[PDB]
Amino acid sequence: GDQRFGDLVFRQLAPNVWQHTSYLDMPGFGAVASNGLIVRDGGRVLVVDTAWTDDQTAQILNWIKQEINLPVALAVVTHAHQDKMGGMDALHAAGIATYANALSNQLAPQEGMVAAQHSLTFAANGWVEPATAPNFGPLKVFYPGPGHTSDNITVGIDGTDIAFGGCLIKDSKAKSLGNLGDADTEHYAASARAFGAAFPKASMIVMSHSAPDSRAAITHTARMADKLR
Numbered sequence: 001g002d003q004r005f006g007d008l009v010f011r012q013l014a015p016n017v018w019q020h021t022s023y024l025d026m027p028g029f030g031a032v033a034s035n036g037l038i039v040r041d042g043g044r045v046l047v048v049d050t051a052w053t054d055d056q057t058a059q060i061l062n063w064i065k066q067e068i069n070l071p072v073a074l075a076v077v078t079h080a081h082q083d084k085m086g087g088m089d090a091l092h093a094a095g096i097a098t099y100a101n102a103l104s105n106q107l108a109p110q111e112g113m114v115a116a117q118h119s120l121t122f123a124a125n126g127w128v129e130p131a132t133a134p135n136f137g138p139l140k141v142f143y144p145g146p147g148h149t150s151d152n153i154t155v156g157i158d159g160t161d162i163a164f165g166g167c168l169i170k171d172s173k174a175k176s177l178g179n180l181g182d183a184d185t186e187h188y189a190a191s192a193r194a195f196g197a198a199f200p201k202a203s204m205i206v207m208s209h210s211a212p213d214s215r216a217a218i219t220h221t222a223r224m225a226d227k228l229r
């Protein structure tokens with residue numbers, strides 16, 4: 001189930017969807033896993049999130065070449081922290097078009113990240129403005145509101161039961177919300193609930209720092225973010 005490829009782990013979640021996992025030692029926390037997604041859409045591949053580093057992100061591209069062997073048409077990254085955007089330069093070196101929330105691109109320099117090439121913007125109801133996410137295929141991008149960070153976005157995969165909450169959602173048995181230093185403590189709980197309502201039929205909830213879980217991850221995250229207000 002978990003395919004080891006160098007220092008990374010890959011897990012198939014659906015016929016056209018894989019989870020990528022990479023690790024970084026955070027002095028004081030251990031070797032922290034971060035998950036993203038790889039989606040085959042016909043003759044091309046779409047990536048959600050980089051790995052922590054450029055070298056690890058180049059290894060994701062090597063795994064794609066070996067296991068799928070189709071071009072990577074684009075990548076979308078889900079907020080301006082290192083586990084999601086740390087490997088942007090590796091995507092750009094490979095010629096891959098990159099997308100992030102306009103606010104993630106604004107924050108990227110001060111957070112120590114390289115910005116994506118393209119900015120997503122969002123309607124008042126949270127759905128991406130379609131002209132900013134051209135050729136996204138089955139990826140449905142949703143801004144649920146500020147939570148884990150002000151810029152966090154989420155992604156559903158059409159044709160599957162999968163929705164990706166990134167670092168906004170923790171699993172059913174998590175004991176805390178993790179890194180809160182950039183969090184919007186007032187709005188976190190509402191944002192987690194908005195993610196769940198945006199993808200009401202997703203039964204497999206993928207997230208950055210836990211293995212895929214049921215919809216119980218969303219309400220546990222929400223039932224827990226209430227504590228920060």
Ligand SMILES: C[C@H](CS)C(=O)N1CCC(C(=O)O)CC1
Pocket residue numbers: 032081082083167177178179209
């Ligand atoms: C560098 C990342 C950006 S989200 C971070 O701050 N982490 C890693 C995940 C960890 C957790 O919540 O398990 C909280 C500390």
Ligand SMILES: [Zn+2]
Pocket residue numbers: 079081148149167179
């Ligand atoms: Zn984060």
Ligand SMILES: [Zn+2]
Pocket residue numbers: 034081083167208209
């Ligand atoms: Zn994270």
